[PDB]
């Protein structure tokens, strides 16, 4: 099925010189790809967006999706807090920068344009227990200084 590609670069919703994917109607500016693709050196063959690459990689199998995300979380056990979020970045296409809506409505003198113009009118356990004990010692010392201060001011 030969679907028509969108005349707007889906990353910046603007029209211009863009390369299109053969498996999704999304087209993207050469400056919007990750990494930005040089219009002089084009990727030879069938080029796909990040979403299509990830999809064909996972072969539409949700079990593989969960397996790979679980492995990715298991490997990122130093930044585990972000792990899940990380697995989402390399799967989805990029977009330009737009602040959230609640930031748009903070001040009344600023208004938004349709073009995007905005106008005004292990070792680690040892280290961590060490930090614990050193801060504890520091603050109990500060408490001792509190007591010394109170005693010196009240004795006089």
């Amino acid at each position: 099925i030969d679907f028509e590609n969108e005349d707007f670069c889906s990353a910046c919703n603007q029209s211009g010189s863009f390369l299109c994917c053969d498996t999704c109607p999304k087209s993207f500016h050469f400056l919007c790809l990750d990494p930005p693709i040089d219009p002089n050196n084009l990727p030879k063959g069938d080029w796909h967006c990040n979403e299509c690459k990830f999809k064909i990689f996972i072969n539409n199998s949700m079990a593989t999706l969960k397996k790979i995300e679980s492995n990715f979380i298991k490997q990122n056990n130093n930044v585990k807090i972000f792990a899940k979020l990380l697995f989402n970045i390399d799967s989805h296409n990029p977009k330009q920068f737009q602040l959230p809506n609640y930031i748009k409505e903070t001040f009344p003198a600023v208004k938004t344009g349709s073009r995007g113009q905005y106008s005004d009118e292990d070792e680690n356990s040892i280290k961590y227990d060490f930090f614990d004990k050193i801060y504890k010692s520091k603050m109990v010392q500060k408490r001792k200084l509190f007591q010394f201060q109170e005693s010196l001011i009240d004795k006089l």
């Binding site: 602040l99 001040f107 905005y118 520091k138």
Partner: protein, 185 residues
Amino acid sequence: TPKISLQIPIKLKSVLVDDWEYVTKDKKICRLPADVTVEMVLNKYEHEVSQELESPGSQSQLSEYCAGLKLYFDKCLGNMLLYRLERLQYDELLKKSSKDQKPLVPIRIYGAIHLLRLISVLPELISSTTMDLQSCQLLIKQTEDFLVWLLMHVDEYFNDKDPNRSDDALYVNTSSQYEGVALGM
């Protein structure tokens, strides 16, 4: 899955809108490499908080979140952190990272402004993932404490000192070439 919000301070929103007017109306671009990288600001936040936390678990969480935000600055600056114009400069660094045979390390270049951008965008990001409620609240508390700490240093990293000295100005006027791609010519 959940609905979640960050109580962003108002002055950081003011800095955000000022940055928007500088890049989109005044046609300015951030000076790269920034004098203070994201490594420096995140490392200073981590190192100044690590001297105030008592229990080991709190500090383990602090360090894990700091390193995670470093990795996210790296993985997101090229994806969602730049406006239409700045991408050119980004691709510029790309070409430079191409000629030096050195992989691009976005964290060692940019300033706290793009980190503020990423933090402000973070709510939708964390809302689009399947993170449980407790880890979501943890992420949000960490981010809000970091935002308060940054607001304490609002001038040291964001205030344009002496607009008469171009050598320290954060934003520089774009060349005639940049507006060429900006107007799509």
